[PDB]
Symmetry: C2
Subunit: 301 residues, 2 copies
Amino acid sequence: LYRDIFGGRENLEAIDFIKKFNETVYLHFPEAITIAEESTAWPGVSAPTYNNGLGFLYKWNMGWMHDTLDYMRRDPVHRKYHHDTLTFSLWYAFSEHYILPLSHDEVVHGKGSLWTKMPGDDWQKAANLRLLYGHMWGHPGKKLLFMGGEFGQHHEWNHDTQLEWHLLDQPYHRGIQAWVRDLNHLYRTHPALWHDGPEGFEWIDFNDRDQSVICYLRKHTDRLLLFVLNFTPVPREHYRVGVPIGGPWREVLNSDAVAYGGSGMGNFGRVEAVPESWHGRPFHLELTLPPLAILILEPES
Amino acid sequence: LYRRENLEAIDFIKKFNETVYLHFPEAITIAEESTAWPGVSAPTYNNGLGFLYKWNMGWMHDTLDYMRRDPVHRKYHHDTLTFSLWYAFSEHYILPLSHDEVVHGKGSLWTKMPGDDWQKAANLRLLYGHMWGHPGKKLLFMGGEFGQHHEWNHDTQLEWHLLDQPYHRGIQAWVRDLNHLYRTHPALWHDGPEGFEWIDFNDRDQSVICYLRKHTDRLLLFVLNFTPVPREHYRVGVPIGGPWREVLNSDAVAYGGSGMGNFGRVEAVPESWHGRPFHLELTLPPLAILILEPES
C-alpha cells in the first residue's frame, strides 16, 4: 500500500492492483475467499471495492493477536493492572470481517512457543493456553491456529524439524488438543458463534479488575452462549453473573475439566438462575469459577 | 343545605365556622353531611363550608356493606373495599362508627359480622385494623370496643359483663393496642394522598389487600386477609430491603386469634414483587391484619 508536487507515500498502482485483483477473483470465482494481513490501520481492507475498500473478504485481526498475547504473558498478579488491554479489543473487533490469528510469525525468532509464552508452572501454562483459546473462540471473528499450537508445543516452530508429536504422550498436551477439538465442535454447532457482528456480542461484565474476570454473551436470534473467564489462578466461589433469561442453565464447556487436564472445579452441569438483579440483568447465575479457566454456559432447551 | 340550596343556612354555616376559629383559633368543628356536597372541610375563603373535619359516611357504608358479606362472597365485592381510597382525600375526614349505626334494628357492629363467634370477633378485629390503617381520624361509639352483642339501648347501661368473656376482652385489647400504634407512629398522622401508597389491590380471588402508610422516613405496611383461610408463602412487595418487624397481628391468641403469625424477624428478599424492588414472604392469618415496619 505504501512506498516508504505529489509527495504521496501510498503506492496507488498497488492499491488498484489489489482492488482489481479482488474484483477479478470473485467475478470468476464467486465462492472463493481472499484474506489479507495488513499491519497498518488501513481502513476497509475487508470492504468491497465499490465502497472504496481493498476488496478482501477477511482481514487478520493482528491488533487482537498482539493485545491478547501481550495480556497473557503478564503474570496474573499483574493482570489487574493491564485489564484494559483485554476489554479494549472489542472496540476494534468490528471494523473488518476478521480472522483471529495465531501463526508461525508469532512462534519463531525468539518470540517463543505459545506454551512458552504463557506464565507460571506447567499446570498454569496449560490452563493459560486453554483460556487463551477459549476466549479466542468466544471472541468475535473467525479462527486460525498454526501447527503445534493445538497441543501446546514447547519448542519454537522449526522448518528443518517435525513437530514434537511425542508431546502428545504427556497429559496436558493431549488435554489442550482435546480442548481445541471440543472448541471447534461447539463452534461448528452453535450458530451464536457464527455471527461475528456487533449483533452477536453483548457484554455481561467488564469491570472486575481486581479479580481480572470478564463476562460476555454471544447471540444469534433466540440462541445465546455465556462466556465467563477467570484470568487468575485463584478460584472464585459464589461469583454472580447477571443473565438475560431465567431458569436452568447448562454448563457446555469447562476449561478446568479433568478431560482437559484441569483441577476439575466446576458447577456440575445444572446451575439455577436466581430471579435477583445483577449486572443490570433481570436474573443471575451464581457460579464457581475454576482456576485460569473459561466457562461456556447455555440456557436449557 | 337544602329544603334548591338554602343559602341563608350556607352563609350561616360559613359564618359560624369563620367566627369560631376567630375567637378560638384552636377549636375543632366536625360536620356530618350525607350528600356529596363538596368542600365541607374546606375554608370559606375557598368557597368551602369552613369545617375542619367531615365524617366519612361514604366509607362507613362501603366498609360495613363489604364486611356484612361472607368471605366466600367477598370475592365478588372486592371493588367496594378497594374503591374507598378514590374518595378518601376529598375532605379532611374522620372515619366514623357512630351510634346511628347501632340502633333501629341495624344491629351492633358485632351482630353485623358474619359467621360463628370466632369469625365475628375476628371480623371486627380485622375491621378496626383496616379502619385504623385507612386514612382519616377515628371515631368509635361506646360498646364497639368490646364488640357488644346488643344494639345501643339508651334506657340501659352497656353490657360490661361481656368484658369478662374472652372474645370481647380481646377486641378491647386490640383497640387499645391499635390506639398505641396510632399515637406512637406518625406514618398514620398524615391522612394526605402522599401518606398512602398501594402495595397490591388486585387479589380478588384470595380477598387480600396490601398497602403502605407513610410519613418521610417511616413506613407502615398493612396486609389484610378477608377470608378465614390462612395464606402461606404470600409475598408482598416493599420499598426497602433488610429486616422487617411484625408490629401487630390481629390473630394473636391474646386477642382471641388462632395465633398464626410472622412474629417479627421477617427479612426482605430482593426479588421484584408488586412492581417493587424487594418482597416479604409472609403468613396471612385468618380474617386478620398484619402490620409491619422496617426494623430500626
